[PDB]
Design a protein around this ligand. Sequence first.
Ligand SMILES: CN(CC[C@H](N)C(=O)O)C[C@H]1O[C@@H](n2cnc3c(N)ncnc32)[C@H](O)[C@@H]1O
Ligand SMILES: N[C@@H](CCCC[NH3+])C(=O)O
Length: 424
Amino acid sequence: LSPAVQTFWKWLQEEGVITAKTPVKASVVTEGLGLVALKDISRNDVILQVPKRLWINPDAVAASEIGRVCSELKPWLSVILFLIRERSREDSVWKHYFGILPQETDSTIYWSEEELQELQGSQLLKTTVSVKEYVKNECLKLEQEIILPNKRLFPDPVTLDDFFWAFGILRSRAFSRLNLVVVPMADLINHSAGVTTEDHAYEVYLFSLKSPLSVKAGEQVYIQYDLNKSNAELALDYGFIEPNENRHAYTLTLEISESDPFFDDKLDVAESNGFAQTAYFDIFYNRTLPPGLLPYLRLVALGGTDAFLLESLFRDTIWGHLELSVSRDNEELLCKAVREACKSALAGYHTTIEQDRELKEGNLDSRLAIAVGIREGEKMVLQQIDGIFEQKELELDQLEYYQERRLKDLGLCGENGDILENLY
Ligand SMILES: CN(CC[C@H](N)C(=O)O)C[C@H]1O[C@@H](n2cnc3c(N)ncnc32)[C@H](O)[C@@H]1O
Ligand SMILES: N[C@@H](CCCC[NH3+])C(=O)O
């Protein structure tokens, strides 16, 4: 099978982890390493249990030599160091475990410069550049204040690659179902679009992993990594995406500018209703617009004419009005801003959807596939969004704006009230 793997398996045996009550063997699969059922496994069956003696979470770093130096470090930044360290110690408890870990995954955080150009104009590129930088800065500060100062516990030098490796390992393997633990045994299990439960990890301490599906002897055991993450998120967290169009999202960001002459009043309205000066709205394919997206767009576009809605008078209704629509000019202003944003963005990509789809018709490499799939999707959501507001621009008059809703209760045709008024 594999020297490293065989050694890793025998290691867990002596540990008592893998014994006779273990219905699965490690095997080499299309997705790397994975757990293959040694015999017909049924639903909710426990595949394996690992001793907390073998975790690698914040607690683990606390009870080690570097427990004190990281005493005030964020949970993750602490495990990043713990990982790098134990990976060097040729006597660590995870010696055989580290000989199983991939030196790199397909997560965008490892992509080369040319690879990244395949995500040109995409939001995923923006997000990955942002994440990459942040973790760089945070980890460079770690070297200065913990890696260098303590030359006794951190002998060997620590490079960025070491940093991203630990960050990557951490972000593609840890289980947050408790919220940041690494379990050497069930660490292998892979993701499948088959599974649709997304909850199969408990303990009686240890790690009980129960196969959500019914696998036949010989076949692989999968699980759902995260029913809610978007492809952009899957692509970054792990090195893969699904073909499922409903995984394609694109997030819009709106904010009440301080350059807005009404910033103060608007910010008040926003916040009194659960929104901040800056708010992000996630837009998924074939899904309906997030609640709040429109009222916030109308609040942004408010402007002079409808400014009277920002008086203490409506503070208890302003949001409702924002939800029903303000005025034809407000509605028409926001629609253009949004559609222009989408057209502008759609222009940032270097290929058309027809092209990406022809590309998917052939054989693409891991990372290229991800890029192409990701960008085709983003273009779809962007195009959908533009479509939605295009309709709105046509129905721009079918809505009943503030004023009309006002004169709805005029009651011109009542009674000759003057008869009565003239009776007293
Ligand atoms: C959760 N980890 C499992 C480790 C993996 N079993 C191994 O040891 O190679 C992360 C890895 O699972 C792989 N993975 C999980 N689900 C899929 C999938 N549907 N397609 C391709 N790779 C997958 C990722 O590429 C990543 O390298
Ligand atoms: N993020 C998912 C799946 C991670 C699997 C890593 N091997 C969870 O809640 O555990």
